[PDB]
Amino acid sequence: QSEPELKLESVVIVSRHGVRAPTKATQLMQDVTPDAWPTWPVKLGWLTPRGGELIAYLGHYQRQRLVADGLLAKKGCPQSGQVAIIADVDERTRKTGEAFAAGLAPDCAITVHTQTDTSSPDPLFNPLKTGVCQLDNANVTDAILSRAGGSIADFTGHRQTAFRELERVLNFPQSNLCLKREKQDESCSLTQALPSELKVSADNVSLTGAVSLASMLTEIFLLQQAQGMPEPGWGRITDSHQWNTLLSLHNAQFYLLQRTPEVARSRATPLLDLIKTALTPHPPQKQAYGVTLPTSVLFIAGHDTNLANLGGALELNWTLPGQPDNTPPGGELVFERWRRLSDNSQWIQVSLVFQTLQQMRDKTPLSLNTPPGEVKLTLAGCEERNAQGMCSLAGFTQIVNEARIPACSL
């Protein structure tokens, strides 16, 4: 046989919460569709049992995968301080932490660590909102518009095919918003009825109108699907190409508001710092959250905004075959440090682990034989690499230090 030349030494998983009920149910939503939105089992913005199971599946799998890689024992509960789990203060992220622990080491008491004050935002998951740092308005306004080809109108103008597909699913033409149209001289259109304006403040960036509404509407259609509801979008979404076209509006909003470096770098700094420290070898010690780092496996329950920010900041671009959502619920940005046995040099690998939309629809159990999707990522800013295509620890450390915004560190 041929022995392993690389040995997995540390794992850091930044995961998006699991499938949850549509965070909202506004009046605008019922005005763009004559149909009735299907009710969910849990409260809005809360993780659903199905969501928790799906996450637990990923956990079962990572346990198997890490065992095969020898970082985790095949049996029993991992050693005290071998696996750490951190979660944003939200209900949905906290439960994603539990769901993942339960699947990684069932019956084992792995606590999920969060900010002590759960009624207040955790700066780790967004240093802007809690005033840790601010965005430079003018620079951010030009960066975002620049990414939009100069104007939001042109941006949307290039995605009308998708907007029309959405309108088709909503039967928007016979909607209240369209029917009570004050300018029924022109044809009905989401982008026209709801003009999208770019709003930039010190702690926040938003895109009103159809851009943000479609992002939310299309995602919900995805959530219904992943939740196994009878007929997502009222049985009007019948093929893969329609799923991709719809969710593209969702990815578009994030490409602009969450991946733009001028937003991503500041919003991703706290996590970059944590990830780097966790991936770098040094003397273990109770640190932020009462956790001990380094260790072996660190799992962080966050949001789609976080993975998108990290992608933007680290210049990591990906498309997930079989999954129309760029950063889907359960999706995991995985960082791994491998040590080359030859000279004991340190290396790091980044990938995106996700469940295809179908794997969520049929709630298919994962394991080495039936794995979730996976896309090995390349750091576009990394020069020093190994035969495996990974970035050196020094390269990655450099990429992190140059991308982070000192002013936004915790």
Choice among 17, 88, 122, 250 that is catalytic = 17
Determine, following the binding rule CB under 5 A, whether residue 195 of this chain makes contact with Hg ion: no
Structure tokens at 68: 């095969």
Q: Which is nearer to Hg ion, 116 or 151 (CB)?
A: 116
For residue 47, the cross-strand partners are 20
* In the complex, minimum distance from the CB of residue 353 to Hg ion, in angstroms, rounded to a whole number: 16
User: Which one among 8, 10, 57, 255 touches Hg ion, defined by CB under 5 A?
Assistant: 10
Q: Quick check: is 304 catalytic? A: yes
Token digits of residue 363: 């709630």
For Hg ion, the nearest residue by Cβ is: 294
Binding residues for Hg ion, rule CB under 5 A, total 14
The answer to whether residue 113 forms part of the interface with Hg ion (CB under 5 A) is: yes
Query: Is residue 10 within 8 Å of 69, Cβ to Cβ?
Result: no
d(CA 3, CA 109): 34
Is 303 annotated as ligand-binding? yes
Residue from 156, 224, 260, 295 touching Hg ion (CB under 5 A): that is 295
Nearest-approach distance from CB 253 to Hg ion, in angstroms: 9
Told to check if 304 binds Hg ion by CB under 5 A, we report yes
- For position 251 contacting Hg ion by CB under 5 A, the verdict is no
74 marked ligand binding residue: no
Residue 18 is a binding residue for Hg ion (CB under 5 A): no
Stretch that binds Hg ion, among 117-125, 149-157, 218-226, 259-267 (CB under 5 A): 218-226
- Please confirm, yes or no, whether 250 is among the known catalytic residues: no
Which one of the spans 61-69, 160-168, 174-182, 286-294 is the region binding Hg ion (CB under 5 A)? 286-294
Cα atoms found within 13 Å of the Cα of residue 337, Cβ hemisphere only: 24
Comparison of 110 and 152: residue with beta carbon closer to Hg ion: 110
278 binds Hg ion (CB under 5 A): yes
Interaction of residue 21 with Hg ion, rule CB under 5 A:
no
- Nearest distance, CB of residue 5 and Hg ion, angstroms: 22
- 172/254 with CB nearer Hg ion: 254
Which is closer to Hg ion, CB of 18 or CB of 294? 294
Cα(first)–Cα(last) distance of the chain, in Å? 48
The verdict on whether residue 20 carries a ligand-binding annotation is yes
Active site residues: 17, 304
Binding-site sequence positions for 1D-myo-inositol hexakisphosphate: 16, 20-24, 92, 267, 303-305
Interface contacts to Hg ion, rule CB under 5 A: 10, 12, 113, 219, 278, 285, 287, 290, 293-295, 298, 304, 325
